[PDB]
Design a protein around this ligand. Structure first.
Ligand SMILES: Nc1nc2c(ncn2[C@@H]2O[C@H](COP(=O)(O)OP(=O)(O)NP(=O)(O)O)[C@@H](O)[C@H]2O)c(=O)[nH]1
Ligand SMILES: [Mg+2]
Ligand SMILES: [Mg+2]
Ligand SMILES: [Mg+2]
Ligand SMILES: [Mg+2]
Ligand SMILES: [Mg+2]
Ligand SMILES: [Mg+2]
Ligand SMILES: [Mg+2]
Ligand SMILES: [Mg+2]
Ligand SMILES: [Mg+2]
Ligand SMILES: [Mg+2]
Ligand SMILES: [Mg+2]
Ligand SMILES: [Mg+2]
Ligand SMILES: [Mg+2]
Ligand SMILES: [Mg+2]
Ligand SMILES: [Mg+2]
Ligand SMILES: [Mg+2]
Ligand SMILES: [Mg+2]
Ligand SMILES: [Mg+2]
Ligand SMILES: [Mg+2]
Lengths: 154, 325, 216, 46
RNA sequence: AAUUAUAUAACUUAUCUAUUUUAUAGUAUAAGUUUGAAAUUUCGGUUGGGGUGACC
RNA sequence: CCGCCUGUUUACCAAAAACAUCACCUCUAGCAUUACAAGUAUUAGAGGCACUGCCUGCCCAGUGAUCACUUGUUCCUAGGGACUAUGACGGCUAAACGAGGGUCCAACUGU
RNA sequence: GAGCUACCUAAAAACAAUUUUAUGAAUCAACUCGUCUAUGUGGCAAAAUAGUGAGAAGAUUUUUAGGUAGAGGUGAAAAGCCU
């Protein structure tokens, strides 16, 4: 049953060169230290990971692990990898700048409770701003344009 | 361990958030986000050229809409476009000066009138000087700033924009002396005085580590800022002529540094020196500038420009006081 | 607050914050961390309250050497984290008793609850106070727990029978006219100690030592 | 306890460890013999 | 921390033997890239001691 | 009070509350002719932690209701398709046992 | 250099009486250990003696031969041991 969804989502896996598949798996085992069960689960839940090139997924994971302090179990259950990098960066920083979301400190405690990870990404942009951030849609559009320009300068 | 920026953010969260409450979220992100720059024309030979060029860029002078002697072209509401870098004019004078639109309200608020003598205490290269100079069609002026290097560039700015003949006239006078001591020097000398007291520069403090008031070593200065602000404001009140108008400008959002300072200073002048100050309301000025500026009316005195995502021109707190006697 | 069952402990933290905000912090106004101090007489559960709050909010575990005899924590302790959300720390302190305890009757109540070491007062003398107080209150819980009789008000009588119930005996020197003879005797001391332990363990029943003072 | 009695004599242990056949087993042991012959030692090994 | 790092593992181009018209195989080797088991070496000065500030 | 117990340790200043320990938990490996092992996942290595009933983390698309939409994710160009049927935590058993660290009574005594 | 000592392989040996039961259970010798106090302090002794204590059918103690060697060995981890 695991293969059929993976096959349907990314049929090119069979045609994909052994190097591409091995590199994606190697990154998780040697650079993300994902458990064996999690690695199989990640491919099944979001088969698009194989499509993504190496050295970009590693940055994506480290963004969740380091910038957001989320544990490996958290990433697998919420399927962060499927979401695009741009969407995560815009929302997460927007929450961070608004004070809603704080990166866990060294002791592992957050002064202000964080919002649900599913809420941040899973919900629609209209619902996201309406509930998670409680801000106007037009203002968020400006923030996205602002953030992109800053990234270009960076 | 904590950087000065971290401490500065901490202070606003514990104090500033309470003051503004539900408005703090938008303001907090606004400060972190990049500031919006508004180009100010240098007039002179490039007076027509810049206006035509700025129209091509689609920037619109918010002052022109307000009227419907300073015009500052700004981008449209919610526009993130960046103005091109300033360039020298044909005569050798810089075409325009990039500055924060809110920074020009204190100058426009001071009600500059012809045949006046103006003092600019602790002006520094804040841009208000250059803007004020362009307003000073027939107005003798004066500049003061505690530091020298800070003042050193201020002259460079004047060289770039102000023509030599105008600067040569006594009208333009540059000095670097203590503001509080300055009060005794020339009492009741300047009809209009613009006092920009040193503030916590919240926007700069968060972004810039260098010379940040929130550094631990500078703890002594930060606590004493309200006292220093009152003395400088009091010095200006002493220096302004009978019937004169003075504007007190503070960058920070702090309630302590903005409203209590001005009201406390008025009390000090009334008691020690037996002088009276007439409060002035700029609500009409706010109504004209609603499109290009957003204010919050909670403040009893002053017209603070809250930085907003749609209009990120804050923060500027300016209050105008007229010397009754 | 019931420490063992954590009854109403949650209510303390909101109250702690509410009072502090109204008061002027002065020097510590800028400091984000909140430090609070718990002080009381010995064996009132001060240390266990710190642990109880820690587990209830931060859910980490014991942060104080809780013990069943007064004198466990000898001096002051470093700040102990309690709640991460307000970042409130508790400061543990040793129990302190003022030299003046007003009337001696107050001391008996203080000894009864275990605040003062039972050695210096003496369990035997304390044991009598329990009988008087319990009889005056009328809460005859002991008779059911200790199957001696329907009721009694003689300290000697109750001690005699309870020792038999526990099968406790000792050899005590008894002065007599013809010499000093070591003759086996019922172990009165254990009865006092064992009886005292049950009272503070709740077997006898809930009591109000100061019931007389409510009318005032 | 009381030290000083580490030597627990056993002829089988002694001869195996530092004996003639043991020394000749390895070239490193044969070079121990070769130096001892150079010096002039009475006994080359056990 | 600075400098390296044919311990290992890996992959890339070559060498090279099979094979099919270019092709996918491997590799007594060499040249790279990636990890690091390790090896080597170091602990500026002034602040009546210490952490922080600092200063040269 | 502390450790669950028997046990182990700095030969020659520390024998313990430290180490081991059963039970419990995590990670790694689908396999042969020299360890593991002449073995094969109820197995072998590596490491963590007293166990035991009980409270107990979060996690558990949304709305209709095994069904449709709204979402989500992808492409093709703001449209069109495609696809989506309680476990990292505490109290603690609770008893027992100890040349452990503190106490108290009794007897005893040249302390 | 593993005749001391840490660990392991092989071949072996010792354990009375009493009570439990059917055992890393109990009292207590041989035997192993080394809690406490005292003496000693160039001492009998480069770690002992006199008392007092812990275990004593077990993860027990002991004997014989062999193996692991310093960029290392061994370690129920004391940075403990390896003449
Ligand atoms: N039954 C019961 N026992 C409680 C309660 N609260 C505390 N105790 C008991 O009281 C003791 C805790 O108090 P403790 O911390 O020792 O007192 P202290 O004030 O810190 N004094 P000390 O200086 O001796 O440490 C423990 O024996 C605990 O079980 C309660 O609500 N019920
Ligand atoms: Mg010797
Ligand atoms: Mg021997
Ligand atoms: Mg050297
Ligand atoms: Mg033990
Ligand atoms: Mg033992
Ligand atoms: Mg020792
Ligand atoms: Mg021992
Ligand atoms: Mg010892
Ligand atoms: Mg012991
Ligand atoms: Mg006695
Ligand atoms: Mg041997
Ligand atoms: Mg050993
Ligand atoms: Mg026997
Ligand atoms: Mg021993
Ligand atoms: Mg014994
Ligand atoms: Mg025993
Ligand atoms: Mg036995
Ligand atoms: Mg250790
Ligand atoms: Mg030696």
């Amino acid at each position: 049953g695991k293969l059929k969804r993976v096959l349907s989502v990314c049929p090119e896996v069979f045609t994909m060169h052994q190097r591409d598949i091995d590199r994606v798996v190697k990154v998780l085992r040697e650079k993300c230290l994902f458990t064996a069960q999690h690695i199989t689960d990640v491919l099944h839940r979001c088969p698009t990971v194989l499509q993504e090139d190496p050295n970009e997924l590693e940055y994506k994971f480290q963004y969740a692990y380091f910038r957001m302090g989320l544990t490996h179990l958290d990433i697998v259950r919420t399927n962060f990898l499927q979401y695009s990098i741009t969407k995560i960066k815009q929302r997460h920083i927007y929450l961070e700048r608004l004070g809603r979301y704080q990166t866990p400190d060294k002791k592992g405690q957050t002064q202000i409770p964080n919002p649900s990870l599913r809420n941040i990404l899973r919900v629609s942009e209209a619902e996201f701003l309406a509930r998670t951030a409680c801000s106007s849609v037009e203002e968020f559009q400006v923030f996205k344009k602002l953030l992109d320009q800053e990234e270009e300068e960076e | 361990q904590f950087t000065a920026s971290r401490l500065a953010l901490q202070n606003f969260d514990m104090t500033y958030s309470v003051q503004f409450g539900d408005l703090w979220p938008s303001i907090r992100v606004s400060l972190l986000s990049e500031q919006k720059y508004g180009a100010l024309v240098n007039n002179f030979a490039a007076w027509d050229s810049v206006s035509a060029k700025l129209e091509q860029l689609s920037a619109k002078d918010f002052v022109s809409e307000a009227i419907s002697n300073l015009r500052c072209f700004t981008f449209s509401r919610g526009d993130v476009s960046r103005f091109p870098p300033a360039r020298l004019g044909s005569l050798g004078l810089m075409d325009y000066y990039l500055m924060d639109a809110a920074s020009l309200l204190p100058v426009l608020a001071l009600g500059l009138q012809h045949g006046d003598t103006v003092l600019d205490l602790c002006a520094a290269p804040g841009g208000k000087t250059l803007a004020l100079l362009q307003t000073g069609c027939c107005r003798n002026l004066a500049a003061n700033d505690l530091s020298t290097s800070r003042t050193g560039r201020l002259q460079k700015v004047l060289h770039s924009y102000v023509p030599q003949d105008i600067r040569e006239g006594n009208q333009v006078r540059v000095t670097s002396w203590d503001g509080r001591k300055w009060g005794e020097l020339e009492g009741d000398t300047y009809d209009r005085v613009l006092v920009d007291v040193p503030c916590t520069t919240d926007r700069h403090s968060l972004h810039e580590e260098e010379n940040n008031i929130f550094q631990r070593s500078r703890k002594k200065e930060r606590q004493m800022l309200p006292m220093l602000q009152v003395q400088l404001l009091a010095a200006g009140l002493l220096a302004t002529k009978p019937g004169g108008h003075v504007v007190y400008s503070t960058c920070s959002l702090s309630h302590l540094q903005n409203e209590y300072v001005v009201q406390g200073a008025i009390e000090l002048l009334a008691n020690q020196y037996n002088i009276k100050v007439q409060v002035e309301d700029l609500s009409h000025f706010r109504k004209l500038f609603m499109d290009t500026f957003c204010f919050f009316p909670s403040c009893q005195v002053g017209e603070l420009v809250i930085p907003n995502l749609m209009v990120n021109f804050g923060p500027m707190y300016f209050c105008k006081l007229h010397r009754l006697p | 607050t019931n420490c063992v069952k954590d009854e109403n402990i949650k209510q303390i933290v909101p109250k702690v914050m509410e009072l502090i905000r109204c008061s002027y912090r002065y020097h510590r106004a800028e400091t984000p961390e909140y430090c609070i101090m718990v002080v009381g007489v010995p064996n009132v559960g001060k240390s266990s309250l710190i642990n109880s709050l820690r587990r209830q909010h931060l859910r980490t575990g014991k942060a104080a050497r809780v013990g069943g005899e007064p004198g466990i924590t000898r001096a002051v302790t470093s700040r102990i984290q309690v709640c991460e959300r307000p970042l409130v720390f508790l400061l543990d302190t040793p129990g302190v008793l003022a030299p003046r305890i007003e009337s001696v009757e107050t001391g008996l109540k203080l000894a009864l609850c275990g605040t003062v070491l039972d050695h210096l007062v003496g369990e035997e003398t304390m044991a009598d106070y329990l009988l008087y107080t319990l009889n005056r209150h009328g809460l005859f819980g002991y008779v059911q727990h200790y199957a001696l009789a329907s009721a009694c008000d003689q300290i000697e009588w109750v001690l005699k029978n309870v020792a038999i119930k526990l099968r406790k005996t000792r050899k005590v020197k008894v002065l007599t006219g013809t010499g000093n003879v070591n003759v086996i005797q019922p172990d009165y001391a254990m009865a006092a100690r064992d009886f005292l332990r049950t009272f503070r363990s709740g077997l006898l029943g809930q009591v109000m030592l100061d019931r007389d003072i409510i009318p005032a | 306890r009381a030290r000083g009695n580490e030597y627990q004599p056993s002829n089988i242990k002694r001869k195996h460890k530092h004996g003639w056949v043991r020394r000749l087993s390895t070239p490193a042991g044969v070079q121990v013999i070769l130096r001892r012959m150079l010096k002039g030692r009475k006994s080359l090994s056990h």
